[PDB]
């Protein structure tokens, strides 16, 4: 079941803002907006997720996951985001 990730984990966000990825035109193109790891039973923005919670209740899990994203701006606005997955054993990409 699709729950929400606490992807904005920081010390500066206090409430719901911890769950919202900001996006602005004041950022430039060809730059990194946000990123995270895919590790449910780890200390990160999955502990708010039922998958991570339930993984904490077990040792070994395996399988395939589904990550979705949802946008909320204007109807008239428009952009293009790259959603890139990099499998483990690697480093997060430097550039686009």
């Amino acid at each position: 079941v699709e729950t929400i990730l606490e992807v904005n984990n920081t010390t500066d966000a206090t409430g719901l803002n911890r769950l919202l990825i900001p996006v602005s035109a004041q950022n430039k193109a060809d730059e990194l907006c946000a990123a995270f790891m895919v590790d449910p039973g780890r200390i990160g923005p999955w502990q708010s997720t039922l998958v991570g919670q339930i993984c904490r209740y077990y040792t070994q899990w395996s399988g395939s996951l589904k990550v979705t994203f949802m946008f909320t701006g204007s109807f008239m606005a428009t952009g293009k985001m790259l959603i890139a997955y990099s499998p483990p054993g690697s480093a997060q990409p430097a550039n686009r």
């Binding site: 984990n9 907006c33 039922l50």
Partner: protein
Amino acid sequence: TRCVMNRNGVLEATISHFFSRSGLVGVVNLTDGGTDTTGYAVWDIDIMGFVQLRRKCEMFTYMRFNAEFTFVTTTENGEARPFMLQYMYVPPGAPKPTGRDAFQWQTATNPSVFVKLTDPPAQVSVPFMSPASAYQWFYDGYPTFTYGQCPNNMMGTFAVRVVSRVASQLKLQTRVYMKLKHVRAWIPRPIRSQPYLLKNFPNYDSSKITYSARDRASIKQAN
């Protein structure tokens, strides 16, 4: 990197196996002396006592199962001596024992089991005792024809003593362990993240609000 590729079986994921593996919920102490103690002990049957399965029980709303209680004992010292105890279960809506030698212990409808202490611990099987079709861990709404106390979650209680008229100078610590048979849940609930404050009511500190996910430096740096 031991990256496993093999699909493992799904039998541990069942609620049945998620509420198995009998553990403890209650520990009581029983000292017997003269007119400076009780010589007996009473313990109301409870679930949400130890907060490891309270989290696993609020993960749903409505549950139905049978209980399997096991009473193990020993002296606070550790030794096991040949004395005969008496455990008695009390169903709801029945008076609880007020004294060691009071009359409730001699009650028939109240079931009881007599063992030696050098006897292996005792086992019992409680069935589903609610009037309702299921237990409700949440009953928003007053029970009046002080708030939210479920009218039917009392399984009953237990009472422990030794069988003697002498004040056997004895100090025991009894541990119970509970197994759940034929669980059936309903209506999953999200897992609570905030530490508790008191029993039976899901209050929370609106100041030291803990966050489920810990804090890192930025959002552009994973690790």
